[PDB]
Design a protein around this ligand. Structure first.
Ligand SMILES: CC(=O)N[C@@H]1[C@@H](O)[C@H](O)[C@@H](CO)O[C@@H]1O
Ligand SMILES: CC(=O)N[C@@H]1[C@@H](O)[C@H](O)[C@@H](CO)O[C@@H]1O
Lengths: 94, 120
């Protein structure tokens, strides 16, 4: 819920600025006296400025599992956004 | 009765902690590895694994195992650093049709300037 960026010029640079940073892709979002970096901020901050929920880019960490003996599942795929933990449970039974 | 969950050596870019929800409602949070005592027959125990990357990493895999057992949980890690923004494929008017629309910003073609590539 915090975002500290500096003169970010793209969505990629924004996302790399921190786990709480999000990017507004709304056309003309930038005013005359503002840098493109204004598009980069926390979700609540962008909503305040009128960016619609579906125009806020916010890649998020995800865990997908698949399917034994002692441990399950057997396979797990994690998509990791820097600074944002991906969580999944492993079950042990004998 | 003593069950430890651990993983093979990882690069400095990956951090992993374990939450151990043992029997008798005994729970350990954010430890270097899973650790529970007891474990009655057919009684399952759960460990919550949390993986955090410090940067956009290169894809790789690693394994999680319970010490003393041959079972393996294969973990594949991939970066989540790309934005899936809207492009201009369905509107030649975007950026006045003289620049590329990239996540809300127009990257004007040479000779064109302006936030919407309208000037010059
Ligand atoms: C999408 C948007 O709000 N941008 C408008 C565009 O629609 C309009 O055609 C142009 C000229 O009037 O000015 C801005 O570029
Ligand atoms: C997100 C997830 O799958 N983790 C679960 C957690 O939600 C749950 O409260 C706990 C107790 O059963 O087990 C795991 O830690």
């Amino acid at each position: 819920q915090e975002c500290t960026k500096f003169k970010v010029s793209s969505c990629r640079e924004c996302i790399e600025s921190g786990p709480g940073c999000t990017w507004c892709q709304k056309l003309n979002f930038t005013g005359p006296g503002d840098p493109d970096s204004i598009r980069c901020d926390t979700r609540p901050q962008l909503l305040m400025r009128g960016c619609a929920a579906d125009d806020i880019m916010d890649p998020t960490s995800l865990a997908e599992t698949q399917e034994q003996k002692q441990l399950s599942p057997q396979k797990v795929t994690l998509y990791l956004r820097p600074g944002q933990a991906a969580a999944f449970n492993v079950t042990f039974r004998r | 009765s003593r069950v430890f969950l651990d993983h093979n050596a990882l690069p400095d870019t990956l951090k992993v902690t374990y939450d151990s929800f043992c029997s008798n409602g005994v729970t350990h949070r954010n430890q270097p590895r899973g650790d529970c005592d007891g474990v009655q027959i057919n009684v399952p125990i759960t460990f919550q694994v949390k993986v955090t990357a410090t940067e956009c990493i290169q894809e790789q895999s690693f394994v999680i195992r319970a010490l003393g057992f041959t079972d393996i949980v294969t973990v594949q890690v991939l970066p989540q650093c790309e934005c899936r923004c809207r492009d201009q494929s369905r509107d030649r008017s975007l950026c006045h049709g003289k620049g590329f629309l990239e996540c809300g910003i127009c990257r004007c073609d040479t000779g064109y300037i302006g936030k919407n590539c309208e000037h010059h």
